[model samples]
Target chain A: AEKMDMTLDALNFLLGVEHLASAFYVQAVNNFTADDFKAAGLAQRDYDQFVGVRNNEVDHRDTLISVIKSLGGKPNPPCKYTFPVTDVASVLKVSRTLENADKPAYLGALRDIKSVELRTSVQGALSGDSAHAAFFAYLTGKAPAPGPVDGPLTQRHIATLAQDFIVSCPYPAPKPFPKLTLSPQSGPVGTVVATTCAQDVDTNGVMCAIISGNQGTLMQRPGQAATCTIPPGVKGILFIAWVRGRDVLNVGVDDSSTVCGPNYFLLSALGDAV
Target chain B: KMDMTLDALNFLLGVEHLASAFYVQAVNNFTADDFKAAGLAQRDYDQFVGVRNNEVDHRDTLISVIKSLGGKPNPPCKYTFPVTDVASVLKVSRTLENADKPAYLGALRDIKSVELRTSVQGALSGDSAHAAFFAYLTGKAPAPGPVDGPLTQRHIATLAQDFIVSCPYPAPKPFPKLTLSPQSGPVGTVVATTCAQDVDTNGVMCAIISGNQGTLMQRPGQASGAATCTIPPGVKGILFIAWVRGRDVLNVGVDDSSTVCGPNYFLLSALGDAV
Candidate 1:
């Protein structure tokens, strides 16, 4: 299949993440003084490092917004966010989470952007985010390594994860829900199918459910693969999945309800006749 | 009369912005030690500095002109270029300068104002000189060639679209409202009726519109004239619109007697209008 083209909505979605990061860092730097850093057992150097990171985040936000506008797209404004910034330790911990998320988000987005220049721009941002994560890890007394792979999440998954931190979104929810890749690609009725979620945002604890016609059954719940038997009467199947502990609304045979929280849905190929 | 299209000028300006950014990044990142290690001469470095300054001037001048034309120019954003060594820098410079020269030449072909034509021709000349310098530095050519590959407005748009990072202003509406109708002879009256709402607003001039294997007498700012165009015996009709401005112009053919438009021109089967 041809790769999907990057849309203005996706760019704005990425810009929204940057806006959150910039807002978080700005609030962290402004609220926490050098004295607070030292009292919390952090060196002044850590404080300075954060200040620099904060400035880069600001630049990232401004640059993305500018690009969006230039493309004749309206940029989403910074939404209200809730961050846990009690002391230096908490700030560094949360900052690490944000930076870590950013790396994969950019990497995932690179698959969708069409322009070579824009891809290069996104890679530059991804590199910066990786460095930031490493620095935060070191500051927290952990190894400054961020493993081999950066991000494997789809843009939808990233947006879903970001919703937890956002109080309200200024833009509409992104279109074209996530897709499901079935092992063996296709199967006849009565095939004990093994299903795995591709582009799962919360990969740690996700449940995959198979629905045929108007009847549905939970194939797997929470970090387990569910083998679903293709029923005799059903000719089509749709797989629905959601991150554990997040909202999963509306489940039935024709499960068309929107996944309101951090979740993903996929429509499988036509089930074969028995 | 109709104002020339700002889209074309804006597109050219955007290319200028990219050229400026490329030079600025090259000059800032590459240093003396790197140049020494690459065995590049200090004279080349000095030339780069001059080129960087020239690009900056071009960017500023383009911005000013776009603004004066009532068009919103795109803002410059951070650019990522590969510039690790002096050799890489010179090679990239040569490539960019080569691209830049054609873009100006493309603009010169389509623009419809006398002042705009003159301005773009000046930039085209500068780009030629710049390209020659880079070519010489990279051991390619001592001087840039006089010939430029012909390009259309559509071609220029594609090139400019690649470099755009962001636009800070709203796009103008009713851009380059143009209409073309055939006259009695091999002539046409091109009117920019809604041109006042256009960014340029100064009005557009009709030159010659043609395809390959044909020629028409080129004229600037002539809405109606005995402009002659000739499609070779075996060729089809003219299919392109060419005009010149203070910034740029395109040539189809030369003017004949005041009464008879050149035979090289032909009346179109259908009149066309666009906004």
Candidate 2:
């Protein structure tokens, strides 16, 4: 008996995946504000990126439609999708997950498709998935580097599978308000002191402690740091001192006893001034 | 002597004869109900009522012209032309539209008087409109106008010169040619396969190839959609036996938009013999 031949179902599967990807991005843009980047911030640029990615998906869909039609078949309709978000955190998290998933899904399917030309085409698409994963990672502040990770792998430890997961990043829980606190220390003569970081964590300019504090003001002060450095790992502290005034003080250590006596006579002691 | 000059008159007589013959045949087999469903039955009825009168008037006009030239009027017997099925009747309408175009273009040149040329040209326009109406009824594209060329007056004169002179016509401008080799065939034996191209609101122009070695032009649209191309004159028809994956047989055409209409369909018909 002649061996049975397996028919080609690759186009069918790819078309379905293409539809799914388009549907995902359409939902992703809906949650973000215009200020997110391309519309504002860097979102204008990233939104443009999504447009290209969306266009790529559309191209993929159309190409498959063409191929299927040539072979005497109809391309599949676009799949329905929603952002998998319980909250904001989940949205970002899920984005990361989906990007990660898509990267390898194409990779694995490459071997399954028989035609070398088609496999090559699929390989190209898989590379796009990797780029998508890196973008999502950068957006969510999970990149190994502080700035955008140009390659799919931000850190060496993320395996091909993880990279796949990273790109297919699914929507995670939303970011709700976290309980925060501010701390301040009182000094003599109505002066005050507070601790500051070289740079804000999460790098969104606004930072607050999850614990309670009495500090009335949170002042952002810039420090000398390398822009190329991933500041997350390089932490430093600075002291913020507020002084209240009526007159200035001068120091002359040569007449310590005389100076101390005169200083005490001239002023009332303000607690913890330094 | 008058009969010799009446050669142009003879051709015009044939035009009327053909038109009258077509309308009479159309009226006999014309399903008023179908035309009405297609939104042209009332119009068809009006044409039927008036076309006979026009033919009579044209014959009478020709008779006077012949008599003025001092020639005896010789009217031929009733004319006959091909009519396929009801669907093909529509095809005939389209074919007529294409056929009358050159004749009208020719007549404007032979008549030297500016007023007479204009009047004849106006009559030619009426013939064209009649052809368009029939084309509309049959569901084919109305004839396309010539692209940019010499001025209309000169163009009409050139056409008339060609018409009266039975010389060879100029070669049409060429499109970029592509030769497709079939999966199995000797070199240079390719021919066009048949396809039903040029579908309009009412009917489709189903083209067939005369023999092997024909080109089967692909209509990229409706690639996923089911469409059938009628094989040209001599080739065997194809059947969709089975498809292992999704739908079978994507039909593509030149238009690249919708393959449902336009030159794409015509190209598909023209290029159908490829494997």
Candidate 3:
């Protein structure tokens, strides 16, 4: 069901953020030696702390990837990251920014993620990030924690902020699945209706496939338009259509149909025509 | 299924590696002035050193166990701990020690072998002592921790991930060469199946039931193609085949077995496609 798929998407996005953080720390740790830290006016102990922080990010990345894979999601690969590396101070400053933002990102994510296990996992990551922020604040000569209240950022906002540092998008931007617009949205028994794509169909060959509960019928149209009779016995019409490179639909149906190929669009609702 | 147990061990090992790195770094870097700032005495410093050494030993022991099981252990990752003063150091140690105790205890219920269980129990005991010592130093109750806590593998893994620098463990072991008939089948019915390579040719094939209750095992080569298995009455949940190859597990096809209907192939199809 789409529930599982939706969960996977959220997980992969979270994994992407962890991947970004891990890459940033790994690069920073690899580039700086103890002498370099001392030369840059950064304490050796502080640099040591960064080393641990980097390791934790890596662990978070791996753990998220494992969970995503277990749930059948492709974990996004780490993207190329750029940070202010002119000196240890610049690096720590950037680290503070990343670490500070991470706590809120995870906190925001906890609201939308469905799985209790996943939410708990995010809380764990969030707590770690909060600890990380406090350490970075200490390194930057700020209060370890300024106050008890912290703000949260939506995933979209977090992505927007993180995009500048990310070299490329590893997964598709979160967007609504292409939809099939049914004329009546719902109707009475044996209602004849026209189904079409909500967005203009770009491909030449586009057709609508309608399913009333479990019974399905494939209706080919002249273009993106198709007319179909809503079969009796089902409460609602489930409209699904596909156009190459235009719209994709997924309607829960018996497997083995050619229409079951990747890239399909779907829309469903319930109403009784009495 | 024990499919999850191996994953859990790898996670626990990562936690150990983090704990080891943390104590190692704290002992090597914290100074007398730093200790005094946190109001710790020489005796406390010596205790910290002992804890650090014990962490190193714990890390090494986990590495050995994982390797012995043919599973790769994660190397110690560089870690970052907030140790601005002696108080912070001891406080963080208390947190780590408290977290460690529950993790080891949680592993106790899942580990199949007597030897591994014994090893985990020892680690649990050590962590309990460590927690008590940290509590004493932090001016909390001397034995503040319960014998067990409600920590799960996922929770521990999540907590550990924050301190880990990198993980080099191999991908999860594959569950190849097996097939289940009536992929989703009815409970209390003998379902069909085919056998592939055994977990070890010497080990037996058994059904590892999950979700409803504890796992179940059957004699080797119980069902071949038309072979049937009665889903134990009152059991309704997922089932997968496993080869208890010696001490390790070789997981086979695991699909849901239900009571309402005959076999359905959706989950099996998903499993087949995952690889």
Candidate 4:
């Protein structure tokens, strides 16, 4: 029954929350090492669960980023976060706290947002928050609640887990590496569409080019330099160009996949620049 | 090894339930005007009715399966919408789609009978289709194409050579080592060996071998190897052991080059017995 315009602020807020949540999870997983979790009393099974959650979070972040960009907005840059790395109890405490904060944020917006479609989209994050809460609860021997928290869920372990907050970069590196770079190209390597000069790769030894279009498709030939255009009403396109090994290219887009080589870029220690 | 019959049925029921939930909730959430904007009123109505019916059928099927096994089925748990905004709903749709893979894969592993496995796979594929549908509605690219959100049709059009030559799943856990036999192909015959007993349920050895020699190129006196044999990028090599009725178990594994030639031969000790 609500008009459409009132929903924009809530939509924008949800986008911001998504960006923050995504950034937080990304930073947490960046330190994901078998050793780190083992130190936190996580068995292989639990470690694996953490990894699965990590991927899920990435997908969530990517999805939201896409949604934001599709609406013609750039995601807020990842905000700095701190995680509980001291112990199992501490980690659980940290996770629960984050999940609790996210729950109300989404629930509040759920009531405020006007678009039915946007509400449904936010449901994914709500579900994720529930899952995350459950995961932490399982780790901490607490019952997981699907709805809002009425009591202090983290009260029991507050004394033990809560400590000096850890400071982390808003955009930390990805797993298994510190940094990634896009390579330059020489010519249209394979199937790069050329519409704008920006779409064209600096084929004079550049590996890739970051370009966007409206036609609903963008592609590139491996080792080639080219840019394509999307149709009207299409929002944006950002490409990451890179040589297989010689160099790295980092283009920013709201949504992207490995349309050329590998179908995805490798995780770097430096965060998602490339 | 995992006694998950009850879990498997529950898993299927869960799929039906969630899909039903998504459809029913979407119906309650979106208005006719919203549907009109999405260009999918009839489609949404059909989805609502169809998925609801399918869930009912699945719920009944699970009950029957459980009853036949002399077990009581659990009642559906309480469910709620995660997000209340349309844009956020689209994001959640993508998450739900991503979550679909794990639950189905879990069920696939737990089902005891191959028939059940296939059935579960079929259901899983259907879930995949469902996931793709929601994904598209939310602006995410479904399968058969990448997400076209930021990119343009023209961009995709010009990207012919940036094709995926091969994609191999990496060893699941414990990091199984994969080895490839030397490339030895004289047209039709490619005799490769794996160190494992059973690669997949098919009893075929699992190895990553790709002879560029197409069916036609797989003729006599051909070089057998493709013009380009370097391992393609973004491939995760893994070991698959097949249980052959007779001859040594076929174990096929993918090489870094995405080739099945020698030097990438997987050793027997590389893989572990089914857990």
DockQ of every predicted complex = 0.01, 0.01, 0.01, 0.01
Q: Across residues A9-119, which tens digit of lDDT does each residue of candidate 2 receive?
A: 556555655666666656666666435543333434444445444544555566567766776665556543555555445655665555544533443334335543343
lDDT of 4 by residue, A1-274 (tens): 3444435444555554455556555666665665777776665545555554455555556666676677665554553545546555665566655554444344444444444345434543444444454455435533222111111111111111121232332432211111122332111223233322213333443333333211112333333243422222211112232322323222211112211221111111111111
Residues A185-252, model 1: lDDT tens digits: 34555555454444445554445544322233344443324344444533222333343432433232
lDDT of 4 by residue, B23-57 (tens): 56765776546655655444443443333443344
* Cα lDDT of model 1 by residue, B2-31, tens digit: 144466677677677778888887778876
The runs of at least 3 residues in candidate 1 whose Cα sits more than 4 Å from the true structure, single-residue gaps closed, are: A1-7, A174-274, B1-275
Ranking by TM-score: 3, 1, 4, 2
Q: Can you give the lDDT of residue B218 in candidate 3?
A: 58
lDDT (Cα, 0-100) at A131 in candidate 1: 46
Give the best candidate by lDDT.
3
Q: Which 10 residues in a row give candidate 2 chain A its minimum summed lDDT?
A: A258-267
Q: TM-scores across all candidates?
A: 0.36, 0.27, 0.37, 0.30
- Alpha-carbon runs more than 4 Å astray in model 2: A1-274, B1-5, B28-31, B37-40, B48-56, B146-275
**Model 3 Cα lDDT, one tens digit per residue, A92-210:** 87787677556545644554466644543554455456556645654554433232123343454455345547656645653223344456543445555565544554645544444
In order, the B-chain TM-scores come to: 0.56, 0.46, 0.56, 0.46
